[PDB]
Copies of this chain bind each other. A is one copy, B any other.
């Protein structure tokens, strides 16, 4: 029998299908099952506090007016251009900053109608979602991104969103991030929005991401270590080499200050302290203490033999004193941020 006729017969003016009316206009709410597939995931920025994702969005619901029985086939595909004659839910993303469709050669849409009236709807989207970040423990941190899917114009009495019982969130094979690691377990929960206009449905996804130490360890931690050792070099120089020792101290202090200033080049202007700030503060304290030690020795040496060995004893003590205290500080610093990071994400 001719396939062209049934397309308008099912849902035209002859049938009386009005796309502006819910499948059950007076009765129980419409239950919608949601499902996403993460195609691409990246472009995480701390300055603007957002990330970009590319997904396929799947929806399923039942419309009794779309049932058919005269074909022998159980399921049949449709055309993207005829989506304007079918009622569809008004899903939208709450934490969105910007989004757009894809129309590279045709409309990237999929529609499928079953015998009993089940509808499968799949579209391709790209999103710029906002994600607040807690930058305490900055180089060693875990973040939790959020994705919200809620209705806009339909109250809880009409639309109710749900998650598919099995496999709600799927990730494409081989997906990797240059800077983060994406965990394999996801948290699924519920919203409920209350406004002046009423009660609205919402569902939520949580992704856990861990930062990598490979880049930061090369970039920030090692050069400060080299500056500290370079400052320590001055303890073996003759005490009479005043221009040499003073120049070494001043250069080390200024370089440490510039490095500490440059450590916050690509971060938002937050108002609390961080791990990298503590590390740079301790390094500044060490180099400043070395320069003050030389200043004290230089002042002591010119008090005119009992004043000669007094100056030498300070250098002898300092040579074995500074690295030991630095080692103790390193031990405590690295232990406390591996017992504090050990706390559960949830």
Contact = CB atoms under 8 A, between A and B. Distances in A.
Contacts of A69: none
Nearest to A164: B196
A82 B20 contact: yes
A154 interface: yes
A102 B292 CA distance: 62
A86 interface: no
A334 interface: no
What is the count of identical protomers in the complex? 5
Interface stretch (A182-190, A265-273, A322-330, A336-344): A265-273
A108 B92 contact: yes
Contact of A247 (B40, B247, B268, B270): B247
A197 B269 contact: no
Nearest to A155: B77
Interface in A119-148: 120, 122-125, 130, 132
B20 A81 contact: yes
Given A233-B291, A243-B247, A215 B110 contact: no
A208 interface: no
A235 to B, nearest CB: 9
A226 B257 contact: yes
Interface string A36-58: 01011001000011000010001
Contacts of A21: 3-4
A interface residue count range (under 10 / 10 to 19 / 20 to 34 / 35 or more): 35 or more
B248 A238 contact: no
Given A242-B238, A302-B238, A79 B20 contact: yes
B237 A298 contact: yes
A163 interface: no
* Nearest 4 interchain pairs by C-beta: A214-B271, A215-B269, A20-B79, A212-B271
29 contacts: A4-B18, A20-B79, A37-B195, A43-B48, A49-B178, A54-B97, A58-B197, A88-B105, A90-B108, A92-B102, A92-B124, A96-B104, A105-B123, A108-B152, A110-B197, A178-B268, A179-B268, A179-B269, A214-B270, A214-B272, A215-B271, A226-B288, A233-B291, A237-B246, A238-B298, A241-B242, A247-B247, A247-B250, A254-B255
Interface of A: 3-4, 7, 16, 18, 20-21, 25, 35, 37, 39-40, 43, 48-49, 54, 58, 77, 79-82, 88, 90-94, 96-97, 99, 102, 104-106, 108-112, 120, 122-125, 130, 132, 152-155, 158, 167, 170, 176, 178-179, 195-197, 212-215, 218-219, 223, 226, 230, 233, 236-238, 241-244, 246-248, 250-251, 253-255, 257, 261, 264, 268-273, 277, 284, 288, 291-292, 295-296, 298-299, 302
